[PDB]
Write a protein that binds this ligand. Structure first.
Ligand SMILES: CCn1cnc(C(=O)NCc2ccc(F)cc2)c1
Length: 149
């Protein structure tokens, strides 16, 4: 697949992250992000995807080195970490045909792994509406420790 870029936006306490919920195949919650255009810089793709999905402009806050990148089934997803955005900020998508909802979620209440089905003697993972966000939660928790303490 083609690389995706986006943001992990945090509030002022650093307790909460901003997630978006899509429709149909993208019906769960995740960080706002999307596919790079041809010849587009990562930081510009991130700013654009976040603006389209949330109405918030991260251009003046992105730090070029502050991101978490994961290759997930051979698809790179890089999310720039944007701390300190006020929780009263009013978010409104441009592409409202693709975004159902936009909400803050507590980091400490988000899972950092999905639960198994071992009490059912069944292999695999139970469905989780935070599936897309989950792989970033531990690395974010470790980046926040290392940056802020
Ligand atoms: C099981 C696969 N799946 C479920 N939900 C997603 C998902 O990415 N939701 C968040 C989102 C981000 C951006 C966007 F434009 C629309 C939705 C992926």
């Amino acid at each position: 697949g083609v690389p995706t870029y986006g943001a992990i936006i945090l509030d002022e306490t650093l307790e909460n992250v901003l997630l978006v919920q899509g429709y149909l195949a993208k019906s769960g919650w995740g960080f706002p992000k999307g596919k790079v255009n041809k010849e587009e810089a990562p930081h510009d793709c991130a700013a654009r995807e976040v603006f389209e999905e949330t109405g918030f402009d991260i251009k003046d806050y992105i730090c070029k080195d502050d991101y978490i990148e994961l290759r997930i089934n051979d698809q790179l997803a890089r999310l720039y970490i944007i701390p300190g955005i006020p929780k009263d900020t009013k978010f409104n998508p441009k592409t409202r045909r693709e975004i159902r909802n936009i909400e803050w979620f507590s980091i400490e209440k988000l899972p950092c792994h999905r639960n198994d089905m071992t009490p059912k003697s069944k292999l695999g993972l139970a469905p989780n509406k935070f599936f897309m966000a989950i792989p970033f939660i531990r690395p974010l928790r470790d980046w926040l420790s290392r940056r802020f303490g």
